[PDB]
Amino acid sequence: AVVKCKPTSPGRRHVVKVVNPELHKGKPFAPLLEKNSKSGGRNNNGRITTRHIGGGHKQAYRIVDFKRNKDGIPAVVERLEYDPNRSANIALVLYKDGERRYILAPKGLKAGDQIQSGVDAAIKPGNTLPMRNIPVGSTVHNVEMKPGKGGQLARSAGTYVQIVARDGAYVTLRLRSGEMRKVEADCRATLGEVGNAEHMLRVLGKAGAARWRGVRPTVRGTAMNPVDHPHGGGEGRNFGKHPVTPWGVQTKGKKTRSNKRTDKFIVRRRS
Amino acid sequence: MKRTFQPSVLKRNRSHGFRARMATKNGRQVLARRRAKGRARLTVSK
RNA sequence: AGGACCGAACCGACUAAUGUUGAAAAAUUAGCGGAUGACUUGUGGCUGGGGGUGAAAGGCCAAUCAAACCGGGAGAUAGCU
RNA sequence: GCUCGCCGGAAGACCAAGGGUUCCUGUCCAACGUUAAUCGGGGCAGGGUGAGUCGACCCCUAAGGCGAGGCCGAAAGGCGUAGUCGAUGGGAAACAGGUUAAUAUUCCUGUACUUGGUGUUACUGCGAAGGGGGGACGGAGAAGGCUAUGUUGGCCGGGCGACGGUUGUCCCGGUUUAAGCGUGUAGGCUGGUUUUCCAGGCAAAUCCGGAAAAUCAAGGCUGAGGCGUGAUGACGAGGCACUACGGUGCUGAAGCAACAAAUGCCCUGCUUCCAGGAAAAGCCUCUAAGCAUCAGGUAACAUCAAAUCGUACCCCAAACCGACACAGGUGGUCAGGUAGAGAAUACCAAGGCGCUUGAGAGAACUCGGGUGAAGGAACUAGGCAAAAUGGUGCCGUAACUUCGGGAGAAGGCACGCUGAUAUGUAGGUGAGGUCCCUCGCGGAUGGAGCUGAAAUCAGUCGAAGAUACCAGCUGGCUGCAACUGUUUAUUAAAAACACAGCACUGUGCAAACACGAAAGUGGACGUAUACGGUGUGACGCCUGCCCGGUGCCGGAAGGUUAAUU
RNA sequence: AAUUCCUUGUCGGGUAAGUUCCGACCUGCACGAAUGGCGUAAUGAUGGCCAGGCUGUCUCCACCCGAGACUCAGUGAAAUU
């Protein structure tokens, strides 16, 4: 749960952390590991395209079944392992046929529950089945926009999506950002919500905690010099412009979505 | 104090060697220019 | 346990004196700060100039930088000495 | 040659990188060496570097490079699949002693080990560009056994002291040995065996995984260290003979025990924490096609083979980087004694040095220091500088407070040596015997020896007992920044930047954005609890009012309005 | 106030004597609310002020110890003109 650390040191005064006792301790399943090198924000041209990225603790990638197409065979969850790659915990399932896989951890799941995937699977938190079958009005997660493409939306910890209507071959969902979006009705999804919901309440406390995760410091525009950034320099503290990006695009209000191809699927833009 | 030239034969060969120069056509142009000028040593080597 | 304390190696340069034709084209001497970390170091690799990088001083990019070095336009032009 | 002084977690020894004969011998002082120079890293001549086990080479691979085909681009070309390269990482094996002026895990002696080939022999399921296993991996913390090593006591060989004593609880020296081989210990890890099935591991599998039974309560894996062997060997203080006076030839006793103990080993171990900690090959196993007497595999024996390149010298400096024989810089390895917490510090050991101009004299003045009557900041922009405090144990310690702190606040007390407590106590260490058995590197007892803080009391010396070195000035009011941190290499380290936190804002994934004439790449193998941009910058109380101006957002069919017609 | 020209504003504290310091008045030339307002424990090689100890900073310098400066032998520059 959420725990505060007492102020023994200034770098420790404001530290608040979430500790889960149930998470398994020990090395993860080796056959599901693979190397993952960090880039530092530089593309194949060796040029920095994204800023504030670099350093951080070394990490290894873990293979997660975002498709869940292995239907007809039940499985038992063994443990809830910790994933440094993402924000949500990952459960290690074993199918009745001895095949081991990793999945996102739904809320309310403990070691021992049954799991089933398929068109005829039972309605319970975690089961996977296309919206041809889910009753209208429920909460799911790990949804996809194209069949067989794998889970694509609402994958961060603590999030979900709410289904509101099925019209013919298209259903309508209310995304976490508030958008009302159409989607093809033969896409599969997982019922329930993603676990580790209290991920919000952590407080980093000190800059070293952020740096452990590989994020470089950000330099304010208003203190810069004129030659590099439009917000420019000047004596004292002078701003006297309208806020703008480093490349000259005005911020604080300007829309940027210009994809006329997929505008047919949006029913209501977020408000 | 620590100053500019810190010798390293491997770096020297890989940055100014015969093969490194000739890998691209600019290096070929440099080699041709040195040959025309008639320099004693075309590039750094043993 | 601690971006916890005192303090060697290690890193840095706050004060004073000398030196400034210097043992040195930025030292030395006596003090000084950090010293399990946002730490420091070896080797190799990548980022090329109106560009790179920059916890951001117009700082660094081979003793140089409000636009590097070499070669060329080029015997630029000079109502000035 | 004798004496003196200095360094000695170095100014000692060995490498890496880098340099290339600077290494040794003979020979000369033309030029170089900040003076002489018979000397030299100088000049000339000659000599010197020996590898199946050490590195390179070689098998594999990360960051990354190149890249058939391919995509894209006026041309030149950019990116990338198959693939190939690329260590700073993974992969087999030699020890001790002796010799040159210059080489030595390379030459010699003795004792080893690894890999591959060939043949003989006996048995015989062999087979991969495929599947499994393993290789194969974070930080911090703790403590039991060890070892290096040192000290002491014995042992052996010497000695009786230039000046008071100095046959003994006196002084000096030594009291050493590897790899491999067997032993499998302290200790760590894991139940084992058999049978029967199975939508999985691209097919296949007896292999892995999963399921169901029966059976046993030990059974494997790992493992420092110790003992034996190696080793009747070598070495060995010395002594003996020549000293072509450098060295050479012989010979050569004792060669034990206790205690202490590493940052090294067990330990790639154990506990614990979140920031969740390379890859591939060698090695073991499964089968696919194929081959079956074969072929091939297995085990023993004998035999052959293990190519090439580097091996001199300096390597915290006179040889490297700095125009210099330059007070500067340069990664790793080993780490004695005394006191001490210490790799600090002062004096020494092994070892290495006195820094390539000297000799006189004792003006002003300058530089680095020592002391100083009385005053004690009166100096000055400013206590700049200098002066001053400084250790261990114990007692005692305010306001404020985010209850953590402040705080080592402040402040005070004891500190040497000798005797006794106690002929060396507490404590630690621990054999011989005794018994039992698992007869083993076994178990209980048992205390010999060995080592040994701290404290009390009594006495005693000095002016001075934390005597040297080493080793915080303290308090009060107050502006700024919450704090650790970063910055103008080379006049500015800060009230500047950053930071955790807060707010707005854009982005529904082929995301926004950014580098690219383009393919493409980052974002991100992430999916609104996420990502980008801007503003402020812990925490607490808060964050009035104004939409006229300028921007941004939502609508215009009212007006004006382009290419076209 | 790191604001404030007039201004060394006025009063109080501190000193024998205080344009600096602290606490108030308010007539804010020309503060003010996320280019943030007010306060804040702890922290700072940070700015300002005041005490005790300490002393050659000073009153006012005196003596001594070493390296130069002087002499002799040897080698043997430079700026400028």
Numbering used by the authors:
A (entry chain BD): 2 to 272
B (entry chain BN): 1 to 46
Provide the authors' original text about this structure.
Initially, the consensus TTC reconstruction revealed an ill-defined density for RNAP, indicative of a heterogeneous orientation relative to the well-defined ribosomal density, suggesting that the ribosome might have translated to different positions on the RNA. After discarding the set of TTC particles with the RNAP distant from the ribosome via multi-body refinement, we were left with a sizable population of particles (around 20%), from which we obtained a TTC reconstruction with highly reduced variability in the position of the RNAP. In this TTC, the 70S ribosome and RNAP regions were individually focus-refined to 3.8 Å and 7.3 Å overall resolutions (FSC = 0.143), respectively. Finally, the maps were combined, resulting in the full TTC. The geometry of the RNAP in this map represents the most probable state, which occupies a ‘central’ position on top of the ribosome 30S subunit. In this structure, the RNAP β-flap, αI-NTD and β′-zinc binding domain (β′-ZBD) are located close to the ribosomal proteins uS3, uS10, and uS4, respectively. We observed clear density for RNA along the entry channel of the ribosome, lined by uS3, uS4, and uS5 ribosomal proteins. In this present TTC structure, the position and interactions of the RNAP with the ribosome resembles the ‘expressomes’ or ‘collided TTCs’ previously described.
Transcription and translation are central gene expression processes subjected to extensive regulation. In bacteria, the absence of a nuclear-cytoplasmic barrier means that ribosomes can translate RNAs as they emerge from RNAPs in a process known as coupling. Significantly, we find that the ribosome increases the speed of transcription at the expense of decreased fidelity by exerting mechanical force on the RNAP and by allosterically inducing an active anti-swiveled conformation of the enzyme. Our work shows that the coupling of translation to transcription prevents prolonged stalling of RNAP at the expense of transcription fidelity through a combination of force and allostery in vitro.
